[PDB]
Amino acid sequence: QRDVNVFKKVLENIGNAVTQFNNDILAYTGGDANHLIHDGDAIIKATENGLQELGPQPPLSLTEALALVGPVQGVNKLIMKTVDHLIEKKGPLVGGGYGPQVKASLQKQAHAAVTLSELVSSKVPSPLAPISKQLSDQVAQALQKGIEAFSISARQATKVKRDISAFQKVIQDISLAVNKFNVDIERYVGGDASHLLADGNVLIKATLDGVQSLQNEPPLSSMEALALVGPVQDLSNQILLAIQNLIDKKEPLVQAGFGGKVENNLRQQEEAAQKLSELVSTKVPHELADISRQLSDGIAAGIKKGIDAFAG
Amino acid sequence: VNVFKKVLENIGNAVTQFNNDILAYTGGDANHLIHDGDAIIKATENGLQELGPQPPLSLTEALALVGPVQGVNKLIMKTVDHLIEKKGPLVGGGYGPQVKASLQKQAHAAVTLSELVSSKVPSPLAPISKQLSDQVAQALQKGIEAFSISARQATKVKRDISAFQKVIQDISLAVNKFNVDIERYVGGDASHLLADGNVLIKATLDGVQSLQNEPPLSSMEALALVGPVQDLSNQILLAIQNLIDKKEPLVQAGFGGKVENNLRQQEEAAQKLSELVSTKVPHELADISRQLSDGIAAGIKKGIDAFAGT
Ligand code: NI
Ligand code: NI
Q1: What is the CATH number of domain A7-149?
Q2: Which stretches within chain B are classed as H helix?
Q3: B41 to each of B20, B44, B51, B84, how far by Cα in Å?
Q4: Neighbours of ion ligand 2 (CB under 5 A)
Q5: Could you tell me where the DSSP H helices lie in chain A?
Q6: Phi, psi of B230 (to 5 degrees)
């Protein structure tokens, strides 16, 4: 009947929102993270809009509830996935400056979601309540796991690691192989073509070697995988994040009384950055100057804030 | 006088747009560039239609119209240069004949325009005008003949891009080293953190020192450190294209069978690799990985078809 097909609709909408959020998260390599926040807000709003429309709905039938089991489960899993994705892209957002906002958003979501769950209990019949409660728990707990991880940073240390060194090496080799003959032919006009053939063979061999190499190597995590695809960006993000972390742990380093030591170090770092960024600005092209500035400036400015925080 | 000036301005704008487009183009779909070129050509043509009926300029009028023409020409030259610089990726994509055609068309139109303009200017300023025209046309040719058939501009293999890589990697290591310790630390002695910071600073300094005497980096040369995955792909495609092009005279020399087998082997290798790669990709990147890999495999296939039994 139509009485059931409104809650269902709401659920679907929520799921869609969640999916959108997930997509956004996936997209976000770094930089401006307003969009993600906006998405989160939208999702929250959508969730809220459920409460307003589900409040006056009647008590469901025994057989009606079981049709509604699948939709909920589907939603919950999706939500969990989204949360996981968000967690995965913790660092860059943090670096950008967007950790408090995100934390807030998650909390808000939890608060809304919890409310929704509470509401839904009284609409379902009382013998399905065990399932429903469990489902709710699965959601809320999951949400918390994100929220908790984005808010205290207790055991949150991002494991420094890179067997990205060997993938990179392989890539380099491949490039060399290509450029090795990609000249040879380009040069070639006629006569014996033995050389070209040899080059091709060599390239093939190289490729084979590369394949062999990446046989036992593990998968690549998306934030970790952007190291090799997006090499400089990752570095930038990880610098920013580091800076943010440092800023965060000012209070209890001032408490331990290292503050002066810290400040000097920060200053030194800033100086180094200035030195490097100047040199860099010399080595860039027509086209890529603007972006180069954009990163460097961000870095320098990021440093500055930290310095301000920890000076004296 | 106004109308001609306006036309010139429009042309300049078009050229600028084209240049911008070229700059943007990392590779992939290159339709847009072609479209831009076409538009530019059209614009140029539209000059002829509006400048034909214009009267003969005065002695004093011509000299005001010297500085704008010059500005235009330089811009055009720059655009051409930029286009040339982004030769390889376009070629790889498959867009080399079209581009060549476009350039030729532009030259033809531009030439016509130049011819037209001679008769509107007075005859004692013709020495300058002709020179200006020549500057353009020659420049255009440099890319146009610049752009088809090959065997002259062979991008030299160059990989000082190593040192930069090393530097960046080092920096990353330094950062990720601190950014772990900091994360860990709750309080107490903070010496360690300070030490880490110092180390990082030192590393940075070293990096700076390193890239002191190293040269500039050319845009396409430079997109190898920022988009390594993509540069490799493009260079591969380009290479394949080149190979395809030089089938005729390798069939003429009669290596064709040898070539074909080699191609097949290469294809096989690609297939092998691309499968493995498909295992190591994540949530989000799979799609792109497919997109490149598929392109590569398909690219190979065409070449194979071309050179099989020939
Ligand atoms: Ni996942
Ligand atoms: Ni230039």
Answers
A1: 1.20.1280.140
A2: 2-24, 31-51, 59-64, 67-85, 87-93, 96-120, 126-147, 161-184, 191-210, 219-226, 228-245, 248-253, 256-280, 286-307
A3: 16, 5, 16, 18
A4: A 286
A5: 7-27, 34-54, 62-67, 69-88, 90-96, 99-123, 129-149, 164-187, 194-213, 222-229, 231-248, 251-256, 259-283, 289-310
A6: -90, -40
Same fold: B2-147 with B246-307: yes
Which letter does DSSP use for residue B188 in this model? S
Judged by CB atoms closer than 8 Å, whether chains meet at A284 and B217 is answered as yes
Please give the structure tokens belonging to residue B192: 């360690």
DSSP state of A153: -
Ligand number nearest CA of A287 is 2
**Cβ-defined contact of B216 to A246 (cutoff 8 Å):** no
Can you name the CATH fold of A222-310? Monooxygenase (1.20.1280)
State the amino acid at position A22 in one-letter form.
N
Question: Resolution limit in angstroms?
Answer: 4.2
Q: Which CATH class is domain B246-307?
A: mainly alpha
SS3 B217: coil
DSSP letter for each residue of A154-221: SS--------HHHHHHHHHHHHHHHHHHHHHHHH--SS--HHHHHHHHHHHHHHHHHHHHTTT-----
Of A12, A88, A254, A37, nearest to B187 by C-alpha is: A254
**Ligand 1 centroid from CA A114, angstroms:** 23
Question: Could you tell me the two tokens for B276?
Answer: 């493995």
**What residue spans define the domains of chain A?**
7-149, 164-213, 222-310
Experimental method: X-ray
Residues whose CB falls within 8 Å of the CB of residue A6, separated by 6 or more in sequence, listed in order = A53, A54, A57
Name the closest ligand to CA A285: 2
Angstrom distance (rounded) from CA A296 to CA A274: 9
Q: Give the three-state DSSP class for A79.
A: helix
Option in B157, B180, B285 nearest A179 (CB): B157
- Residue from B20, B180, B208, B241 whose CB has the most chain A CBs within 10 Å, to mutate: B208
- What distance in Å separates the CA atoms of residue A151 and residue A296, rounded to the nearest whole number? 28
Q: Does domain B2-147 have CATH number 1.20.1280.140?
A: yes
